[PDB]
Design a binder for this molecule. Structure first.
Ligand SMILES: N#Cc1c(Cl)ncnc1Nc1ccc2c(c1)CC(=O)N2
Ligand SMILES: N#Cc1c(Cl)ncnc1Nc1ccc2c(c1)CC(=O)N2
Ligand SMILES: [Cl-]
Ligand SMILES: [Cl-]
Ligand SMILES: [Cl-]
Ligand SMILES: [Cl-]
Lengths: 4, 124, 124, 4
């Protein structure tokens, strides 16, 4: 999971 | 927005769509290319091809279970492109590049047409 | 094999699947969550959820156009997860995390359950 | 396009  | 994103999600969706295709699960159209037939999902075809997007948004053609391609279309070229649609992988070879490019032009798959043009220019 | 790969293909397919959903194009099921209804494509739902994969591979349920979820399922939680399925983006907030996690557990969406557990543990 |  990432900060898009 | 303040969303988080799962990097592999799109790839995992496509991998599962390909698994469904391989098992003939909820496939809703057969693409006929001369003597050959290819089962697929209309939504995936529309999502990858300008030609299929046009066909299946048509008020009559959206309901067809069989679509016959132009007799000039090469079945191997179509097969390579259908695999690309479901995997992101293009089996581009010296022996098939001309057929792949002509099929990609017909199907309106601009990025495939672009890499074919580039690979051809490099060999001249 | 000796294939080349188009990096953005999977993401572009998903973006187009979401565009089709927004325009209600070739959607083939309505998911009922108490008083709310959500139109979707069965293939996308199966590709994202263990529960939908089970439902639509069932020889009777595969043909249903309406699926009613358990009355304990929160419609907002379902909406957030359906958006995630079609975009890879999860709108996870303090006010919705419990509903999102319970819905992801029911839908069998392991990666979502995992990030919810991690975000909850960080706040305790 | 890349070599996967
Ligand atoms: N399904 C869908 C769809 C939608 Cl909803 N919006 C926009 N394009 C869509 N698909 C589509 C249209 C044109 C082309 C491609 C795909 C690849 C390409 O080279 N040309
Ligand atoms: N459609 C399809 C499908 C196929 Cl074909 N093969 C394998 N899994 C499939 N989908 C599916 C099954 C289990 C789970 C998910 C998706 C996400 C998750 O957390 N659990
Ligand atoms: Cl027909
Ligand atoms: Cl393309
Ligand atoms: Cl029904
Ligand atoms: Cl997930």
């Amino acid at each position: 999971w990432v900060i898009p | 927005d303040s969303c988080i994103q799962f990097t592999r999600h799109a790839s995992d969706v496509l991998l599962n769509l390909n698994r469904l295709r391989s098992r003939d699960i909820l496939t809703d159209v057969v693409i006929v290319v001369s003597r050959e037939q290819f089962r697929a999902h209309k939504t995936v075809l529309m999502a990858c091809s300008g030609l299929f997007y046009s066909i299946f948004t048509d008020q009559l053609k959206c309901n067809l279970s069989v679509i016959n391609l132009d007799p000039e279309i090469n079945p191997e070229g179509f097969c390579i492109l259908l695999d690309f649609m479901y995997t992101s992988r293009l089996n581009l070879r010296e022996g098939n590049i001309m057929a792949v490019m002509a099929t990609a032009m017909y199907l309106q798959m601009e990025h495939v047409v672009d890499t074919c043009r580039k690979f051809i220019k490099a060999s001249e």
